[PDB]
Amino acid sequence: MNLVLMGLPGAGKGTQAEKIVAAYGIPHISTGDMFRAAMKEGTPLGLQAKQYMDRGDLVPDEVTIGIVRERLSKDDCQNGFLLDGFPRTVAQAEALETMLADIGRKLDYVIHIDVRQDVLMERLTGRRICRNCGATYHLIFHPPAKPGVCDKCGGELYQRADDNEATVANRLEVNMKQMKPLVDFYEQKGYLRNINGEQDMEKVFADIRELLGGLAR
Ligand SMILES: Nc1ncnc2c1ncn2[C@@H]1O[C@H](COP(=O)(O)OP(=O)(O)OP(=O)(O)OP(=O)(O)OP(=O)(O)OC[C@H]2O[C@@H](n3cnc4c(N)ncnc43)[C@H](O)[C@@H]2O)[C@@H](O)[C@H]1O
Ligand SMILES: [Zn+2]
């Protein structure tokens, strides 16, 4: 099962991805996470990605396509995979068709999680993450028991560098311009499936699971 989760920042891609991989046992490939990992490690790519990420801009296509190509070549992707946040430009989608064909694979579904921009703004600015264990909370939608403290480990909660209002405004704009044309691109190939992301988390997951059940039918 080869899947793509696509959506504007804050739509709930990572949230749903965790639930999906836990049910199927397939790898979760997130370009955002890979870039953050390179940043922490201090590699040449992490230093380059940092500048774009901090501004809410997209990292150049050539660079992004390369790290994905390398990741998809591993044996752990033999039973399927879930691409989260890639592709997000037409150039990236065209490259993906080719990269997959090269390893003898074709996409099953491109799940587009749709949410209105005003809601997305709130989704991101209110997000708080645990500095210790990485658990995610939301000040409005799902707050911790005690303010500023992680329920899981007692760690400090903080706001991601790119989740401030100004950076979020730029992220939404560039992703809207680059990613939205992908809806049409994938509708044409028949891979696209829309999911209403303005529902409670379990309901969004149920809609996805229902969609995925059809692959086994
Ligand atoms: N392909 C690519 N090409 C070029 N550059 C690339 C690239 N990929 C990455 N990059 C670069 O890397 C940067 C970062 O990329 P990335 O980290 O991938 O940024 P993103 O796409 O903006 O996604 P987000 O993590 O911010 O949101 P999400 O939808 O996963 O949200 P979550 O599930 O936490 O949910 C958000 C919040 O809402 C809450 N929530 C989730 N679902 C619900 C729900 N149903 N109801 C209420 N609250 C909910 C969550 O708890 C949370 O607080 C990019 O800006 C770019 O610089
Ligand atoms: Zn924690």
Side-chain angles (χ1 to χ4, degrees), residues 84-99:
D84 172 9
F86 180 94
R88 66 176 76 191
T89 75
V90 176
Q92 290 176 22
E94 295 185 318
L96 181 62
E97 285 299 287
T98 301
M99 296 174 25

PDB file of all heavy atoms in Angstrom, residues 84-99:
ATOM      1  N   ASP A  84       4.299  11.685   3.889  1.00  0.00           N
ATOM      2  CA  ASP A  84       3.595  12.727   4.617  1.00  0.00           C
ATOM      3  C   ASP A  84       4.244  14.077   4.320  1.00  0.00           C
ATOM      4  O   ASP A  84       5.375  14.340   4.748  1.00  0.00           O
ATOM      5  CB  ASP A  84       3.670  12.367   6.121  1.00  0.00           C
ATOM      6  CG  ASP A  84       3.150  13.466   7.045  1.00  0.00           C
ATOM      7  OD1 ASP A  84       2.564  14.453   6.561  1.00  0.00           O
ATOM      8  OD2 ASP A  84       3.321  13.335   8.282  1.00  0.00           O
ATOM      9  N   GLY A  85       3.549  14.901   3.544  1.00  0.00           N
ATOM     10  CA  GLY A  85       4.082  16.218   3.213  1.00  0.00           C
ATOM     11  C   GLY A  85       4.892  16.274   1.934  1.00  0.00           C
ATOM     12  O   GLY A  85       5.493  17.301   1.620  1.00  0.00           O
ATOM     13  N   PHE A  86       4.960  15.149   1.227  1.00  0.00           N
ATOM     14  CA  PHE A  86       5.650  15.075  -0.060  1.00  0.00           C
ATOM     15  C   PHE A  86       4.753  14.218  -0.950  1.00  0.00           C
ATOM     16  O   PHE A  86       4.323  13.149  -0.531  1.00  0.00           O
ATOM     17  CB  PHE A  86       7.028  14.408   0.056  1.00  0.00           C
ATOM     18  CG  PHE A  86       7.773  14.325  -1.260  1.00  0.00           C
ATOM     19  CD1 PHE A  86       8.691  15.310  -1.625  1.00  0.00           C
ATOM     20  CD2 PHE A  86       7.538  13.269  -2.147  1.00  0.00           C
ATOM     21  CE1 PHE A  86       9.354  15.248  -2.852  1.00  0.00           C
ATOM     22  CE2 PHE A  86       8.194  13.194  -3.379  1.00  0.00           C
ATOM     23  CZ  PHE A  86       9.106  14.177  -3.733  1.00  0.00           C
ATOM     24  N   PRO A  87       4.485  14.657  -2.188  1.00  0.00           N
ATOM     25  CA  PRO A  87       4.959  15.896  -2.837  1.00  0.00           C
ATOM     26  C   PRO A  87       4.136  17.131  -2.466  1.00  0.00           C
ATOM     27  O   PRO A  87       2.997  17.014  -2.013  1.00  0.00           O
ATOM     28  CB  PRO A  87       4.744  15.582  -4.316  1.00  0.00           C
ATOM     29  CG  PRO A  87       3.444  14.809  -4.278  1.00  0.00           C
ATOM     30  CD  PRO A  87       3.628  13.872  -3.107  1.00  0.00           C
ATOM     31  N   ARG A  88       4.708  18.323  -2.628  1.00  0.00           N
ATOM     32  CA  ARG A  88       3.924  19.526  -2.374  1.00  0.00           C
ATOM     33  C   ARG A  88       4.080  20.591  -3.468  1.00  0.00           C
ATOM     34  O   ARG A  88       3.631  21.737  -3.332  1.00  0.00           O
ATOM     35  CB  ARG A  88       4.068  20.056  -0.938  1.00  0.00           C
ATOM     36  CG  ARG A  88       5.397  20.565  -0.531  1.00  0.00           C
ATOM     37  CD  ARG A  88       5.299  21.129   0.891  1.00  0.00           C
ATOM     38  NE  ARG A  88       5.248  20.116   1.949  1.00  0.00           N
ATOM     39  CZ  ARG A  88       4.950  20.372   3.219  1.00  0.00           C
ATOM     40  NH1 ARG A  88       4.643  21.603   3.593  1.00  0.00           N
ATOM     41  NH2 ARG A  88       5.077  19.430   4.144  1.00  0.00           N
ATOM     42  N   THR A  89       4.654  20.159  -4.594  1.00  0.00           N
ATOM     43  CA  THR A  89       4.809  20.992  -5.787  1.00  0.00           C
ATOM     44  C   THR A  89       4.641  20.059  -6.979  1.00  0.00           C
ATOM     45  O   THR A  89       4.889  18.854  -6.862  1.00  0.00           O
ATOM     46  CB  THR A  89       6.184  21.708  -5.895  1.00  0.00           C
ATOM     47  OG1 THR A  89       7.190  20.770  -6.288  1.00  0.00           O
ATOM     48  CG2 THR A  89       6.571  22.371  -4.573  1.00  0.00           C
ATOM     49  N   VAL A  90       4.266  20.613  -8.133  1.00  0.00           N
ATOM     50  CA  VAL A  90       4.071  19.791  -9.332  1.00  0.00           C
ATOM     51  C   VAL A  90       5.361  19.082  -9.741  1.00  0.00           C
ATOM     52  O   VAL A  90       5.336  17.903 -10.104  1.00  0.00           O
ATOM     53  CB  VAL A  90       3.489  20.609 -10.499  1.00  0.00           C
ATOM     54  CG1 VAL A  90       3.390  19.737 -11.748  1.00  0.00           C
ATOM     55  CG2 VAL A  90       2.092  21.117 -10.127  1.00  0.00           C
ATOM     56  N   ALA A  91       6.491  19.779  -9.616  1.00  0.00           N
ATOM     57  CA  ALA A  91       7.791  19.203  -9.941  1.00  0.00           C
ATOM     58  C   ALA A  91       8.052  17.993  -9.033  1.00  0.00           C
ATOM     59  O   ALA A  91       8.561  16.976  -9.481  1.00  0.00           O
ATOM     60  CB  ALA A  91       8.897  20.232  -9.774  1.00  0.00           C
ATOM     61  N   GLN A  92       7.695  18.100  -7.755  1.00  0.00           N
ATOM     62  CA  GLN A  92       7.895  16.982  -6.852  1.00  0.00           C
ATOM     63  C   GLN A  92       7.008  15.783  -7.213  1.00  0.00           C
ATOM     64  O   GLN A  92       7.443  14.640  -7.126  1.00  0.00           O
ATOM     65  CB  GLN A  92       7.654  17.408  -5.406  1.00  0.00           C
ATOM     66  CG  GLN A  92       8.721  18.352  -4.866  1.00  0.00           C
ATOM     67  CD  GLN A  92       8.414  18.860  -3.453  1.00  0.00           C
ATOM     68  OE1 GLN A  92       7.646  18.250  -2.705  1.00  0.00           O
ATOM     69  NE2 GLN A  92       9.050  19.969  -3.079  1.00  0.00           N
ATOM     70  N   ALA A  93       5.768  16.053  -7.619  1.00  0.00           N
ATOM     71  CA  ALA A  93       4.827  14.980  -7.987  1.00  0.00           C
ATOM     72  C   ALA A  93       5.277  14.258  -9.245  1.00  0.00           C
ATOM     73  O   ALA A  93       5.190  13.035  -9.328  1.00  0.00           O
ATOM     74  CB  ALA A  93       3.422  15.541  -8.166  1.00  0.00           C
ATOM     75  N   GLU A  94       5.758  15.011 -10.233  1.00  0.00           N
ATOM     76  CA  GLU A  94       6.250  14.394 -11.465  1.00  0.00           C
ATOM     77  C   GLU A  94       7.460  13.514 -11.166  1.00  0.00           C
ATOM     78  O   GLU A  94       7.552  12.379 -11.641  1.00  0.00           O
ATOM     79  CB  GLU A  94       6.578  15.461 -12.509  1.00  0.00           C
ATOM     80  CG  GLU A  94       5.324  16.204 -12.944  1.00  0.00           C
ATOM     81  CD  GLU A  94       5.554  17.195 -14.056  1.00  0.00           C
ATOM     82  OE1 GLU A  94       6.570  17.926 -14.023  1.00  0.00           O
ATOM     83  OE2 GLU A  94       4.697  17.255 -14.955  1.00  0.00           O
ATOM     84  N   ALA A  95       8.342  14.003 -10.300  1.00  0.00           N
ATOM     85  CA  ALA A  95       9.529  13.249  -9.915  1.00  0.00           C
ATOM     86  C   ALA A  95       9.135  11.969  -9.190  1.00  0.00           C
ATOM     87  O   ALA A  95       9.743  10.929  -9.391  1.00  0.00           O
ATOM     88  CB  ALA A  95      10.440  14.100  -9.029  1.00  0.00           C
ATOM     89  N   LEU A  96       8.103  12.048  -8.347  1.00  0.00           N
ATOM     90  CA  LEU A  96       7.656  10.879  -7.598  1.00  0.00           C
ATOM     91  C   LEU A  96       7.137   9.750  -8.504  1.00  0.00           C
ATOM     92  O   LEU A  96       7.389   8.579  -8.233  1.00  0.00           O
ATOM     93  CB  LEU A  96       6.584  11.261  -6.565  1.00  0.00           C
ATOM     94  CG  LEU A  96       6.065  10.113  -5.700  1.00  0.00           C
ATOM     95  CD1 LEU A  96       7.173   9.499  -4.850  1.00  0.00           C
ATOM     96  CD2 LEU A  96       4.965  10.645  -4.805  1.00  0.00           C
ATOM     97  N   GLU A  97       6.413  10.100  -9.561  1.00  0.00           N
ATOM     98  CA  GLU A  97       5.884   9.087 -10.475  1.00  0.00           C
ATOM     99  C   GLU A  97       7.037   8.267 -11.008  1.00  0.00           C
ATOM    100  O   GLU A  97       6.989   7.037 -11.020  1.00  0.00           O
ATOM    101  CB  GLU A  97       5.161   9.736 -11.657  1.00  0.00           C
ATOM    102  CG  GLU A  97       3.804  10.291 -11.314  1.00  0.00           C
ATOM    103  CD  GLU A  97       2.860   9.209 -10.807  1.00  0.00           C
ATOM    104  OE1 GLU A  97       2.401   8.392 -11.634  1.00  0.00           O
ATOM    105  OE2 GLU A  97       2.596   9.167  -9.589  1.00  0.00           O
ATOM    106  N   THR A  98       8.079   8.978 -11.445  1.00  0.00           N
ATOM    107  CA  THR A  98       9.301   8.369 -11.992  1.00  0.00           C
ATOM    108  C   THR A  98      10.079   7.533 -10.966  1.00  0.00           C
ATOM    109  O   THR A  98      10.435   6.395 -11.235  1.00  0.00           O
ATOM    110  CB  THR A  98      10.228   9.465 -12.597  1.00  0.00           C
ATOM    111  OG1 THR A  98       9.529  10.162 -13.640  1.00  0.00           O
ATOM    112  CG2 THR A  98      11.489   8.847 -13.178  1.00  0.00           C
ATOM    113  N   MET A  99      10.359   8.114  -9.801  1.00  0.00           N
ATOM    114  CA  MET A  99      11.073   7.421  -8.738  1.00  0.00           C
ATOM    115  C   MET A  99      10.375   6.105  -8.378  1.00  0.00           C
ATOM    116  O   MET A  99      11.037   5.094  -8.160  1.00  0.00           O
ATOM    117  CB  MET A  99      11.131   8.285  -7.474  1.00  0.00           C
ATOM    118  CG  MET A  99      11.918   9.591  -7.585  1.00  0.00           C
ATOM    119  SD  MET A  99      11.762  10.585  -6.060  1.00  0.00           S
ATOM    120  CE  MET A  99      11.426   9.364  -5.003  1.00  0.00           C
TER     121      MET A  99
END
